[PDB]
Paper text:
Botulinum neurotoxins (BoNTs) are among the most toxic substances known. BoNTs block the release of neurotransmitters from peripheral nerve cells and cause botulism, a deadly paralysis requiring respiratory assistance. HN transports the LC across the cellular membrane, while HC is responsible for anchoring the toxin to the neuronal cell surface, by binding to both a ganglioside and a protein receptor. BoNT/B, BoNT/G and BoNT/DC utilize synaptotagmin I and II as their protein receptors, while [name], BoNT/D, BoNT/E and BoNT/F instead use synaptic vesicle protein 2 (SV2).
To understand how residue differences within the receptor binding domain of BoNT/A1 versus BoNT/A2 may impact their receptor recognition properties, we solved a high resolution crystal structure of HcA2 in complex with human [name]-L4. Our structure is largely the same as the recently reported crystal structure of HcA2 + [name]-L4 complex, but our structure offers a higher resolution (2.0 Å compared to 2.3 Å in the previous report), and revealed a different position of [name]-L4, resulting from a significant rotation and shift of [name]-L4. The final protein model contains one molecule of HcA2, residues 876–1295, and one molecule of [name]-L4, residues 474–567. The C-terminus of the right-handed quadrilateral β-helix of [name]-L4 is bound to HcA2 by forming a continuation of the β-hairpin in HcA2 (residues 1141–1151), with an interaction surface area of 474 Å2. In the crystal, the N-terminus of [name]-L4 forms a crystal contact and packs against the previously determined ganglioside-binding site of the neighboring HcA2 molecule in the crystal. This crystal contact is most likely the reason that Sialyl-T (ganglioside headgroup), present in the crystallization condition, was not bound. Also the rotation of [name]-L4 causes the distance between Lys955 of HcA2 and Glu556 of [name]-L4 to go from 3.4 Å to 7.2 Å and thus preventing formation of a salt bridge. His564 from [name]-L4 forms a salt bridge with Glu1156 of HcA2. HcA1 uses Arg1294 to form salt bridges and a hydrogen bond to Glu539 and Ser519 of [name]-L4 respectively, interactions that HcA2 does not possess since Ser1294 in HcA2 cannot reach those interaction partners. In the structure presented herein, it may interact with the C-terminal carboxylate of HcA2 (Leu1296), where only an acetate ion could be modeled due to the lack of electron density for the entire residue.
Author numbering:
A (entry chain B): 473 to 567
B (entry chain A): 876 to 1295
Write the structure that this text describes.
Amino acid sequence: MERDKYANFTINFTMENQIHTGMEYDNGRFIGVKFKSVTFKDSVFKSCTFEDVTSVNTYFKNCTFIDTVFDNTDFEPYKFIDSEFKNCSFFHNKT
Amino acid sequence: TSILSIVYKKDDLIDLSRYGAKINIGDRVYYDSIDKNQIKLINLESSTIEVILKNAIVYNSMYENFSTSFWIKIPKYFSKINLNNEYTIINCIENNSGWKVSLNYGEIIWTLQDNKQNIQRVVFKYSQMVNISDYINRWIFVTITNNRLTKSKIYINGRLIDQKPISNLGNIHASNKIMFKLDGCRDPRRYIMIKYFNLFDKELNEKEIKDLYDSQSNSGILKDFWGNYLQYDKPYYMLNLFDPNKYVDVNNIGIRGYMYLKGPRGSVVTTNIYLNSTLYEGTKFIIKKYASGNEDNIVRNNDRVYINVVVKNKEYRLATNASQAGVEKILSALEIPDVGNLSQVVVMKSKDDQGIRNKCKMNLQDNNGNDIGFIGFHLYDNIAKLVASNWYNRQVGKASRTFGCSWEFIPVDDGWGESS
């Protein structure tokens, strides 16, 4: 009944048409990723880094982000629905 | 007027007042290397300052008026352990009467307690949900006055903030000791910095409070964003006060490149605890000593300097060709040995022509001493290039409002907590 964990990874591929629920991502790097039609639900991101990311029709719903950085992403506030942040940072936003 | 005036002397604290208060300092009290009057107290029982007042000046009265002033720097509160947790910091309460200063999330609190254990409090509140805060982790001047027939009043940076009637309070019999100590703070990493604690035997008036503020501000010395002395040979991130949503960038090195204001500036967040712009962005500036004959490392009003700009970990020189056409002179980052006779001397300003303290300005001059202009910015095809422009100086000379030539210098500080 814990969340399924995925840790110490680097994702650098196009992720599309998929829903991830009840996941815990720890020390994960999302670098050079395009998200299209992706939703993370009820998931936790600890010490993750999103870097150079674009997202279309992509959301984080009821997710918790801790010690997480969003660098050179297009993640605007509307992409986070009912979510929360603990000691996170956004910078170099796209456009 | 003064009945206790604590200053730094010789790896120690002393009282300048006539009453010669005894001061016992614990193991783990620290003085800042640059300004030794800035005292750091940490969250340990050994980080204490105990001031023993002579009996003659112990507060014991229904009627005597009294005030206190001091400067304080309070780190940002980062997490839920900091919510809803009042902790005493300066304590003169004995047998449940006296006064104290305490803190809490976004608050500075003053408490009076009489000998029936009646209490009145005044509070300063500040938000952590602001892009750029005037208060979080910055030096703030606090003044609290008490008139036994009227009100307790709290001033912040000379400005009246909160006031409450205290004619409900009877005899207040405070302690003969003041204890400076974090007391009841559940965050093990919490600290404070304080400077220039004073006690006065009257209700200070507005003018007295403003003069204290102006006086103790050192307005001939430039300050960094945190309120510390601005320093030579120290990396600073630059904030343009008129457009705080950008940071400084350089498109290319050399006289065909230019410095400009790039956005958007980022943010740091903890849901419902803080939400602020990131401060550690852009090409850092390093102020280099040029004409000052002052042997210390502090930057003073009217110091003539050079500005080094850091671009990918290498230092270049901020300069322009004042012969370029137009009042606005676009600034470039040049190889330090290629500067030649380009204009690069900067006059650092902490105050205007009539001696009024104000935000940092940089007046670029040529090598004949002619002003080329305060450094601000101008839009060239939607790009906000840094310029020196004498229009700014003419506006300053007329007392007019300027826009974009006022800057803050931000060094990395452990009370702010962002990563660099």
